[PDB]
Amino acid sequence: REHWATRLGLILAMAGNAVGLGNFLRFPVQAAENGGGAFMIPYIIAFLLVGIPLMWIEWAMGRYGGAQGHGTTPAIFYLLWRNRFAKILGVFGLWIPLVVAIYYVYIESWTLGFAIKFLVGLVPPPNATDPDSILRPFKEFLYSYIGVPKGDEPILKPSLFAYIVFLITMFINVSILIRGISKGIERFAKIAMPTLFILAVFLVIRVFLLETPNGTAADGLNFLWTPDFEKLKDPGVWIAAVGQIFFTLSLGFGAIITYASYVRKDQDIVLSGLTAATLNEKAEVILGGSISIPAAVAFFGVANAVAIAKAGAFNLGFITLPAIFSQTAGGTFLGFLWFFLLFFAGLTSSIAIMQPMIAFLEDELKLSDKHAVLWTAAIVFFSAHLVMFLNKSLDEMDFWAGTIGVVFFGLTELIIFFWIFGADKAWEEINRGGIIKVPRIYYYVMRYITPAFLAVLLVVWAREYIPKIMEETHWTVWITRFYIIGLFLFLTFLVFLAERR
Ligand SMILES: CCCCCCCCO[C@@H]1O[C@H](CO)[C@@H](O)[C@H](O)[C@H]1O
Ligand SMILES: CCCCCCCCO[C@@H]1O[C@H](CO)[C@@H](O)[C@H](O)[C@H]1O
Ligand code: NA
Ligand code: NA
């Protein structure tokens, strides 16, 4: 079995796994939408009660599985619980990361496309000071890029350039993964993560120097870091915080598990896992949280920044922020650095959520690494055409896989590992070879708190918010639901072919 060559490489690979578009696009929107500081107390608590414990669990299961030649959950789940149902629930460890990849890589290609056009200057005056005169040209620049529908039809007509940039983006993803763990993912991580950190820090400093009559970047930080306990009784804020923690740490994706399956059997995962987890949180709340919010707050104020955030998941990062930069000397180049930052962030994550299906084809169907990557890329490239042309197919998959799916799977893997497999032997697996030991308090959190917190969260979620979306959507949501259900059954069938091999 291939293994990471260095501890540093492993941590940066796993840090590049987590540090992605979630840190710089999702977290700002989630935080701004929920009162900044009002959002971070749940966020901090969710990290300590969900994020950290599940991080260790996923490392442990991956390492455990890798030791026996299996880095994906269909097999690992069966190793932890020899029941045919374990293999079927294990399929979600392939389905979630594949479905998330189908639209993640596309949004990743936007950041590359934008970056190219901002670098070359093919982008949309301060003499005009009315705001909408500055934001509309960037709204239209994005809407024309991805082809937002103008008429009654729910169809997207993405640019030719966007389509081509998508092809290039997958070619880049394949270029890395086709070289393996050590010489591929690990080598790119050691380059991308330094670059990512330097770009983010530079952007943070340029943003902190933004000042306008409606505020400063400082007002954005005090809005983000001013505690508030009015909404700590609000279910929506807790479910947003826990959803964000799952997504940003790549938990419930099966991706952490697959990476960890390439860690040597007796090599530490306790400190390593905690380091990658904490590195992502620093990149999230200090870098991600100090670019978009302070910029929008400084230029528009908090009320209008909160409105912008509520406007959409891409309004802030793809429209508002470049619009703000455009009012700065060299702002188009600053835009380039922002989207280049976003690209390396997403690319380091997209390669990680595609390797689960790659490792399944290598480990269970015994495909060569080369063919495993190409077939995986073809599956993602083809399926992405749903996301590229059907309006809001992106949202439907991000909901079932990237929001409901991750949480459901996170609770499933915990139950399999810590209840059925055995809390005491799971605890042994986590700490075996640990440089440090997991705080013994966390044994009880992982066994009783984390599952209760996720279980309670999923019912107040499933029987309150989702009946709304499950009843009055446009019929085209069924197209995406139909397709990703077919995907699940296709993967179930490969698991069936792998069991009988
Ligand atoms: C995988 C092949 C079948 C899927 C059909 C989608 C391929 C069509 O792709 C389309 O081709 C056009 C050519 O000008 C481009 O302008 C469009 O942006 C592109 O989306
Ligand atoms: C980074 C690689 C991008 C190569 C694809 C460029 C295709 C963009 O083609 C676009 O449409 C028309 C040409 O038919 C013209 O408006 C411009 O050449 C161009 O903006
Ligand atoms: Na992240
Ligand atoms: Na990443």
Author numbering: 5 to 128, 131 to 507
Please share text taken word for word from the publication where this structure appeared:
LeuT, the bacterial homolog of hDAT, has provided key insights that have improved our understanding of Na+/substrate-coupled transport in the neurotransmitter sodium symporter (NSS) family. In the NSS superfamily, which includes DAT and LeuT, thermodynamic coupling of substrate and Na+ -co-transport occurs via an alternating access mechanism that comprises the opening and closing of the IC and EC gates. R445 is aligned to R375 in LeuT, which forms the R375-E6 salt-bridge as part of the IC gate. Previous studies of LeuT conformational dynamics have shown that the network of interactions between the N-terminus (residues R5, E6, W8), TM6/IL3 (Y265, Y268), TM8 (D369), and TM9 (R375) are key to occluding the IC vestibule in the outward-facing occluded (OO) state.
First, we determined the effects of substitutions at the LeuT residue corresponding to R445 of hDAT, R375 in LeuT: LeuT R375A, LeuT R375D, and LeuT R375C. In all structures (superimposed), L-Ala, Na1, and Na2 (purple spheres) could be modeled into their respective binding sites (left). These crystal structures showed that R375A and R375D substitutions in LeuT precluded salt bridge formation between R375 and E6, and between R375 and the backbone of I184 as was also observed with Rosetta modeling in Figure 4A. The distance between residues R5 and D369, and between residues E6 and I187, was conserved in all three structures (right bottom), as also found with Rosetta modeling. We found that both neutralizing and acidic substitutions at R375 likely promote the dissociation of the E6-R375 salt bridge (closest atom-atom distances: WT = 2.1 Å; R375A = 5.4 Å; R375D = 4.2 Å), weaken the interaction of R375 and I184 (closest atom-atom distances: WT = 2.5 Å; R375A = 6.0 Å; R375D = 4.7 Å), and decrease the thermodynamic stability of LeuT (Rosetta scores: R375A = +4.4 REU; R375D = +5.6 REU relative to WT). In R375D, the probability distribution of the dominant short-distance component (OO) decreased, such that more open intermediate distances were sampled in the Apo state (black trace) (left). Similarly, R375D suppressed the short-distance component (IO conformation) in favor of an IF conformation in the Apo state (black trace) (right). The addition of Na+ was able to partially rescue the probability distribution of the IO conformer, where Na+/Leu resets the IC gate to the IO conformation (right).
